[PDB]
Amino acid sequence: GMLPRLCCLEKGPNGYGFHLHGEKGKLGQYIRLVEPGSPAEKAGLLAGDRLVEVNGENVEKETHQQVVSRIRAALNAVRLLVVDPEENTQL
Ligand SMILES: [Cl-]
Ligand SMILES: [Cl-]
Ligand SMILES: [Cl-]
Ligand SMILES: [Cl-]
Ligand code: NI
Fold it and tell me: Which residues carry this modification: Phosphoserine?
């Protein structure tokens, strides 16, 4: 498809089932460690994906702490717009 993947997750008993990872001295948060059978896997989330939006707000330039806050503070559901960094670039 041509639209970025939009992963819509409902929180389970063990959370969403993925980790969020940031680099050194460079903006960007990425998906890691997607648990098998989790809401994250069922929604199509993949390790290595760059997180572009959370619940309709752009997080490409935000700190790790801000993005976690935006994912968490939400009410047991989150919509994550993600892209393959290999094939996608913000200009
Ligand atoms: Cl690390
Ligand atoms: Cl990973
Ligand atoms: Cl979103
Ligand atoms: Cl980029
Ligand atoms: Ni890139």
Answer: 38
CATH assignment of the domain containing 81: 2.30.42.10
CA dihedral for 79, 65, 62, 20, sign (positive or negative): negative
Residues in the chain: 91
- Distance, CA 13 to ligand 4 centroid (Å)? 34
CA of 30, nearest ligand number:
2
Number of CB atoms found within 10 A of residue 16's CB: 25
- What resolution (Å)? 1.5
Taking the C-alpha atoms of residue 91 and residue 82, their distance in angstroms, rounded to an integer, is 16
Query: How many domains are there within the chain?
Result: 1
Approach to solving: X-ray
